[PDB]
Design a protein around this ligand. Structure first.
Ligand SMILES: *C/C=C(C)/C=C/C=C(C)/C=C/C1=C(C)CCCC1(C)C
Length: 137
């Protein structure tokens, strides 16, 4: 697998519903859905080490981790969490998140390279799965 590349979103499903579970009110959810349509992921992968830059028009953030080594990031709604990435197969990884503070819905994300040159990312909050599909820029 090489996830490395500059990825451009082509499809985004169930994102508003994810944010609803997470407690975001509707006007902000619609504004977030719009931001998600102009959103890009840059990945540099070296073996089991990943550098990931996620950016929208006005915001950019970096996630760096090594598979199997716990790290700190934030949930989709910005709450700090403890995260651990494991492989599920050659081209799919799964991340479990644990809130650093307080309580909230159970959240996780996945990344998968398809055999057709697509990157599929999912994000989960309890019962709700948002799916996002990217192609290489
Ligand atoms: C491996 C990829 C990861 C962990 C992706 C994380 C993506 C986000 C935290 C996305 C957040 C977004 C918003 C909260 C509002 C709309 C734009 C997004 C999709 C960039």
């Amino acid at each position: 697998p090489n996830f490395s590349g500059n990825w451009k979103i082509i499809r985004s499903e169930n994102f508003e519903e994810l944010l609803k579970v997470l407690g975001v009110n509707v006007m902000l959810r619609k504004i977030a859905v719009a931001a998600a349509s102009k959103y890009a992921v840059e990945i540099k992968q070296e073996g089991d080490t990943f550098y990931i830059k996620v950016s929208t028009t006005v915001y950019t953030t970096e996630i760096n981790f090594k598979v199997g080594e716990e790290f700190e990031e934030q949930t989709v709604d910005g709450r700090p969490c403890k995260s651990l990435v494991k492989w599920e197969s050659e081209n799919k990884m799964v991340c479990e998140q644990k809130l650093l503070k307080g309580e909230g819905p159970k959240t996780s994300w996945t990344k998968e390279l398809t055999n057709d040159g697509e990157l599929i990312q999912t994000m989960t909050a309890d019962d709700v799965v948002c799916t996002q599909v990217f192609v290489r820029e």
